[PDB]
Design a protein around this ligand. Structure first.
Ligand SMILES: Nc1ncnc2c1ncn2[C@@H]1O[C@H](COP(=O)(O)OP(=O)(O)OP(=O)(O)O)[C@@H](O)[C@H]1O
Ligand SMILES: Nc1ncnc2c1ncn2[C@@H]1O[C@H](COP(=O)(O)OP(=O)(O)OP(=O)(O)O)[C@@H](O)[C@H]1O
Ligand SMILES: Nc1ncnc2c1ncn2[C@@H]1O[C@H](COP(=O)(O)OP(=O)(O)OP(=O)(O)O)[C@@H](O)[C@H]1O
Ligand SMILES: Nc1ncnc2c1ncn2[C@@H]1O[C@H](COP(=O)(O)OP(=O)(O)OP(=O)(O)O)[C@@H](O)[C@H]1O
Ligand SMILES: [Mg+2]
Ligand SMILES: [Mg+2]
Ligand SMILES: [Mg+2]
Ligand SMILES: [Mg+2]
Ligand SMILES: [Mg+2]
Ligand SMILES: [Mg+2]
Lengths: 871, 348, 176
């Protein structure tokens, strides 16, 4: 079983709208495609003994064991590779169950689709499923060590990409509130929202956290100075630069019960909390001396943490260090084993509490209390195993949020404002949080910028608090948006033209409009990038841009099939047409399948938004029954039963009638403008340009723009040569006209042919046609020039020559001859220049139509003829 | 503008305004400067990554951790005219701006190796500083390193003495320009140009005495604020917004600030949080700009107050009684009222 | 707190006094079956519809003889709540909880017993419920619990000894 191709999808796609995270593997069953399990002896018992959990897999039979009801009656490794990749991920906690198998290409090649949690773990499991499954169709078993090491790699891959818990807390709440989020390429930052409404976070710091506040909070001498100048209670203490003066320093402080700290800040090191004797001060001195805040008075009370978010109190918790108590006449080592078995204790963050560990530091703490491991404690005596509180070291946290006195609430909020920090943790020492600090002689010990949350969202006693909700409320204040409007345009033909017009109309309101097309990425007429910029990678440039207010995005099938959509949902989804282009590529062979790709846009429109459908297109109009959004329609014929049924129920439609482009809103008609006065349409002679204009006008209307704005936009929009090269470039050359286009699929040859039919001048001829990459549709294309043109010349012996020589010129003329034999010059005249000069074969005011292998040549060979200007 | 100000007791901060309308500053940082933006701006790899992902032009280069692979690295970069830097950030040290030969790369390598951004393409143009304050451009200046020119058939040591007597030159900040000092580093710079102190320069030849521009080392600054093209203005403002900094200095290399950077092949080299102002308020050529006015306008927006009402009560008898009653009356409007008396200081 | 009119003021004629009043910002209306059966509702649609209980009172009057019919009268309020609004139903009442399948609006529930399968199924899908638990009146919003107050400290309830007053308090808190 060979893997030929792997795709990773991230967003709504062809296989599923909701299952955004999928891996699509193209697997070549060189063997096994001819052996449906019953031809592979032992491949039932072997597969289940290796992976005994594969009973929880259901297939067509909706039963437990439904997978195993088969397997022995095989599926030609469909289902088996799929279910193994899903089970290998499930075995390590990557929780995923969606999957599908479909045969493609030649017999034996399958598309295996499965759900992932982590991108690399997902791809790893796929490859591992193939190795496991292949060994079992060769031999009857799979080594245990070849399963255990793969599970170990999946566990590491799923750990390395994890977000820290403070980021997970904020992100989870953001999803509940429908705020989009993205990871950024630098410094572990996360973006929340789109365009001009974006915010950034990093753990517990945000775009609202100022630098002066954060730096002051990290300066202990600075913080103390600022707070005592504001009338806020702080500990009394001094500065002794390792002079042997501690014995005197205690006199200014007030006596022996003092705290000795390293002068610098190097975590919880070299600190003695309660010095009772002279020699203890010296031992502390010798440790303090290791670094380059000393002799504070020791205040007697508990350690409380207060969380303040936007100048307002959110949560309060009491912290207690790891300890044991005199729970009967047992020793300390016995008490530790008795309580360390509590089911709420375990490693990391997989439990509420963690385990108690005895080490040299626990012993040092116990010795100061007069106890050791073999000591028996008196009933109800408490012995501490740690100097400071921390949940990660085995301590506890008790919620005291509703027990805090109103005056203490006022003081805490004032402290955060004085030091200038939005999200702050305040460390308070007091015997009673329910009484004023001035009555209990309490103090504020520390102010911490960017505090953690485990102790407030997962306390060991009391009720959990939703800490994230107050954070998102300051970042995205009540009734304020996190998104900018998105207008997504798709369909086989006309996307680029529709996209540029729609962006032009929005621009008349004075907003910053960003858009992407197959030519470039633009913001307010400045070019950001050039080249084919369709697809999810370009959409992300516009959505991450801090200045963009409106996004207009042309969407191609290549992007959807290769990686999914970049935006999840949108306000307006426009589907222009479905036609038989790109068939056979991307595993899509039929028109019915192509319609399922285009319908992805219609199905991601938000219920409060609109889908804009073409009522003159039977595959597109039919999408209306899948759409959860409102539906608007456009057409080139007012007498369209769909339109009539729709406006009779007070829907909205755009139609072309009486020479005008107008909007039907229930019983009322709004005329926007005349087709002949809108420059993109060649004097009303290009029906396909009229249809593109109707779609843009209707999208602008249903999304709230006024009619006058729409009129201004259509009247000033241009598609001149060198703005839209290769797309209807009609040149004026004395008493003669020439047209350069670049029809791709057959619909564009017909669209140009109708322009030709409507022309009121002299005879027409064509000097071009399709190349080597066309799959014998060349005869049909030759048949379009027939009965459209008076003079039809084959030029199709170009330089590209992907296959053979000028075979398409021969196939094209067969088509020309079958439908319009006798057409002037049904011969091959040249490869290039001697034919696209054949303006000299046309009488006064006639026209030369060019369907070149390359637009640049097509237009430069007109410039050399000394043209006057645009038609 | 009549905004009251005070010094604070910690970290050299200054307070502007009273009560609920107060703002704080520290040099070129303020109460509106975010930490995520300032830290990103100090991370050169981070800044480059974020800007190139936004479609913004930056220098091409790589990462060589003192492996003797510079001779190959230049092939991905595009050739010999490259810049070799210490991998870390330790001021203007161990840096060669234009490596022309293999052995020069090695000398630069040996110096780069002293620290724990290498082999960039060397783009040819002048060094311009652009100042952006609130997502809006304030000033542009062109910076040139200390130099002398072929002002007749004189030697370099003679030319230095001739121009170092210019009355606009002096110590510190007491003048516009400062003095030119010849030291071992001036000599190292002159040797690379083919000159020494006794060399006579050809008419109109220019010789540089420093590798980089700085007014404090004897260079010059020319105001070019009104010569910058509208597209370049748009790009500079977008850069400040992408990196998240209110007051920012942007370092741009280009041959012509009046043409789009895409046409002159210019690049953005560095983004500096909290830039200085001497070069914009005291340029050596061109007109001085009032840089502070745009800063105070963001801190204290048009038609917004910097002060709170003050009611002062004095007289021989009755002050405390009058003070408590007046505070009580204001309090009935729901505002926070603070007051002082001979008994205590109160807030609400 | 100013009295405009006295007497039995339920029904559509009184609702119209409040709705036509140029000073009113919020309208709270008790709705009786006599008003609905005699003349319909005065307002067409509303933001919150609260149904407290269905019981065998007033049977035989107004052509309604059975409890199943009485439930169809009470369900009129639940069925006129705007889709953007909420219906507040009693999960401990089998005729009332069943109205949830007719409602086009969002549904919130209240109960006197946290161990009510309806409540559990509902909060597991991130719905909202109000329950009486551990001496407290609290709101369950998905996985988070919000305690409002203790039953014994709320004066309308006789020291926590009147279960029917607790249930009335839960309905008012949840609607708010
Ligand atoms: N003067 C004091 N009186 C009483 N307890 C104090 C005093 N100073 C500090 N403590 C206690 O010592 C604990 C250790 O915090 P400390 O002030 O040493 O900060 P630190 O060095 O950053 O350590 P940590 O990481 O534990 O916060 C405080 O949480 C507090 O409970
Ligand atoms: N609505 C339409 N129906 C049919 N043909 C059209 C229509 N609009 C334009 N065309 C023709 O098809 C050509 C393709 O035009 P355009 O570049 O706007 O298409 P597109 O959908 O962006 O294509 P691509 O897949 O290359 O991006 C036009 O030059 C014209 O000849
Ligand atoms: N790729 C480059 N091409 C051309 N000039 C460059 C290039 N990289 C840096 N420079 C020049 O080198 C000068 C030195 O700045 P550098 O990037 O070395 O920052 P630094 O080490 O902080 O030094 P300084 O304090 O002078 O800014 C820049 O101002 C710029 O003119
Ligand atoms: N307007 C007044 N004229 C004369 N005596 C007054 C007046 N108001 C108060 N007193 C008297 O003077 C005493 C001083 O009162 P009060 O404490 O209000 O004065 P003060 O101006 O604040 O004085 P101090 O200088 O002590 O602060 C009062 O107790 C009363 O006996
Ligand atoms: Mg601490
Ligand atoms: Mg296409
Ligand atoms: Mg296109
Ligand atoms: Mg610099
Ligand atoms: Mg006096
Ligand atoms: Mg007084």
């Amino acid at each position: 079983m060979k893997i030929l191709k792997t795709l990773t999808l991230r967003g709504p796609n062809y296989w599923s709208i909701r299952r955004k995270k999928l891996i699509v593997m193209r697997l070549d069953l060189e063997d096994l495609a001819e052996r449906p399990s019953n031809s592979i002896p032992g491949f039932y018992e072997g597969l289940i003994k290796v992976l005994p959990s594969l009973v929880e897999h259901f297939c067509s039979p909706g039963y437990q064991g439904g997978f195993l009801e088969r397997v022995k009656e095989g599926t030609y490794m469909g289902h088996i590779v799929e279910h193994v990749a899903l089970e290998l991920q499930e075995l390590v906690g990557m929780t995923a169950g969606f999957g599908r198998t479909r045969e493609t290409s030649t017999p034996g090649v399958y598309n295996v689709v499965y759900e992932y949690v982590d991108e690399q773990a997902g791809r790893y499991a796929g490859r591992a499923a193939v190795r496991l499954c292949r060994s079992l169709v060769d031999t009857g078993d799979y080594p245990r060590l070849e399963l255990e090491k793969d599970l170990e790699d999946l566990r590491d891959l799923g750990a390395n990409s994890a977000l820290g818990p403070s980021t997970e807390t904020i992100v989870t709440e953001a999803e509940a509130r429908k705020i989009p989020w993205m990871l950024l390429s630098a410094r572990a930052m996360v973006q929340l929202g789109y365009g001009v409404y974006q915010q950034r976070i990093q753990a517990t710091l945000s775009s609202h956290s100022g630098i002066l506040g954060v730096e002051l909070a990290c300066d202990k001498e600075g913080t103390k100075t600022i707070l005592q100048d504001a009338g806020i209670p702080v500990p009394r203490g001094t500065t002794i630069q390792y002079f042997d003066d501690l014995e005197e320093a205690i006199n200014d402080v007030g006596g022996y019960p003092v705290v000795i700290k390293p002068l610098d800040g190097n975590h919880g090191r070299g600190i003695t909390i309660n010095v009772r004797h002279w020699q203890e001060a010296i031992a502390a001195y010798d440790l303090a001396a290791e670094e380059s805040i000393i002799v504070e008075r020791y205040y007697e009370g508990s350690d409380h943490r207060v969380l303040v978010v936007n100048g307002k109190l959110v949560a309060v918790a009491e912290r207690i260090p790891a300890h044991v108590t005199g729970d009967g006449s047992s020793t300390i080592s016995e008490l530790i084993e008795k309580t360390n078995q509590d089911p709420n204790r375990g490693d990391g963050h997989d439990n509420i509490l963690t385990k108690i560990v005895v080490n040299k530091t626990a012993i040092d703490v116990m010795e100061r209390q007069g106890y050791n491991l073999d000591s028996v404690l008196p009933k109800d005596e408490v012995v501490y195993l740690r100097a400071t509180a921390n949940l990660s070291t085995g301590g506890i946290a008790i919620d005291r949020t509703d027990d805090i006195h109103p005056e203490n609430i006022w003081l805490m909020e004032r402290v955060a404002k004085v030091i200038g920090l939005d999200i702050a943790g305040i460390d308070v020492v007091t015997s009673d949080i329910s009484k004023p600090l001035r009555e209990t002689n309490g103090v504020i010990v520390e102010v911490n910028a960017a505090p953690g949350f485990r102790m407030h969202v997962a306390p060991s006693q009391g009720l959990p608090r939703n800490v994230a909700a107050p954070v998102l409320d300051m970042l995205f204040p009540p009734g304020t948006p996190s998104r900018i409007p998105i207008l997504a345009v798709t369909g086989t033909n006309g996307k680029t033209t529709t996209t540029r017009l729609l962006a032009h109309i929005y621009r008349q309101t004075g907003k910053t409009v960003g858009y992407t097309s197959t030519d470039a990425i633009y913001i307010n007429e400045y070019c950001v990038e050039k080249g084919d910029n369709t697809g999810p990678q370009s959409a992300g440039v516009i959505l991450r841009d801090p200045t963009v207010e409106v996004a207009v995005l042309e969407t191609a099938r290549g992007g959807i099939l290769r990686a999914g959509l970049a935006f999840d949902s949108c306000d307006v989804g426009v589907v222009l047409n479905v036609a038989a282009d790109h068939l056979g590529l991307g595993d899509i062979d039929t028109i019915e399948q192509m319609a399922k790709v285009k319908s992805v846009i219609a199905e991601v429109v938000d219920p409060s938004g609109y889908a804009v459908l073409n009522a003159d297109d039977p595959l597109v109009a039919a999408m209306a029954d899948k759409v959860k959004a409102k539906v608007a329609y456009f057409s080139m014929n007012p007498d369209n039963p769909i339109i009539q049924a729709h406006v009779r129920r007070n829907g909205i439609a755009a139609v072309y009638e009486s020479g005008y482009l107008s909007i039907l809103e229930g019983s009322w008609t709004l005329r926007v403008e005349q087709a002949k006065l809108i420059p993109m349409t060649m004097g009303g002679m290009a029906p396909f340009m009229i249809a593109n204009a109707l779609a843009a006008c209707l999208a602008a209307f249903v999304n709230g723009l006024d009619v006058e704005v729409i009129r201004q936009g259509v009247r000033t929009f241009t598609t001149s040569a060198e703005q839209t090269p290769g797309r209807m470039n009609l040149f004026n050359l004395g008493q003669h006209h020439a047209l350069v286009d670049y029809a791709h699929n057959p619909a564009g040859y017909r669209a140009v042919g109708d322009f030709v039919k409507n022309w009121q001048g002299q005879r027409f001829g064509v000097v071009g046609g399709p190349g080597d990459r066309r799959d014998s549709d060349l005869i049909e294309l030759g048949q379009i020039a027939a009965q459209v043109f008076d003079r039809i010349i084959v030029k199709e012996d170009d330089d590209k020559r992907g296959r053979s020589e000028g075979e398409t010129a021969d196939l094209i003329v067969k088509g020309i001859l079958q439908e319009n034999p006798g057409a002037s010059y049904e011969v091959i005249l040249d490869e290039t220049i001697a034919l696209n000069k054949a303006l000299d074969q046309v009488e006064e005011k006639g026209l030369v139509v060019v369907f070149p292998e390359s637009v640049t040549r097509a237009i430069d060979l007109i410039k050399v003829r000394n043209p006057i200007g645009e038609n």
